[PDB]
Amino acid sequence: NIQGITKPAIRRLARRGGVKRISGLIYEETRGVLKVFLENVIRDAVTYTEHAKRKTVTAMDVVYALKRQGRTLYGFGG
């Protein structure tokens, strides 16, 4: 499932940031990382959602959660 992220995908990213030669393992050092992230981010954003006793996570359910990791996402205020 993790292989959901292709090669040029992770690359494009790695490219946007200004990277020339994208090494080997890198491709999995992203599936790896992006995994730690969506984790700490979804577990947070889900606890808030189980508080309001909801079966649907809310846009705001996530944002509040980034706002805990130290990332203030903007464009979504419900």
Partner: protein, 90 residues
């Protein structure tokens, strides 16, 4: 509800020939609350350190003073300590 409509009129103020989208409206709208939340906060953290149980126009001042950097700060002051006056005397 939200600041959207206010974020619009003002937009027209400093820029008439210009427009906006809706996502870029979402951000504005996400911007306002983001600064509100910081100012009223650190201003709330302010009226607290000094036992005062009320937020003065001075709290919000020394509060902005502490949240907005060098040059951004100075101008939010003159738009404030000049918004209290034209509110009081008139």
């Amino acid at each position: 509800e939200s600041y959207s409509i206010y974020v619009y009129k003002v937009l027209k103020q400093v820029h008439p020939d210009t427009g906006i989208s809706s996502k870029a409206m979402g951000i504005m709208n996400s911007f306002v609350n983001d600064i509100f939340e910081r100012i009223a906060g650190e201003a709330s953290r302010l009226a607290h350190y000094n036992k005062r149980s009320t937020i003065t126009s001075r709290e919000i001042q020394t509060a902005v003073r502490l949240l907005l950097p060098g040059e951004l700060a100075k101008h939010a002051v003159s738009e404030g300590t000049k918004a209290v006056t034209k509110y009081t005397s008139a």
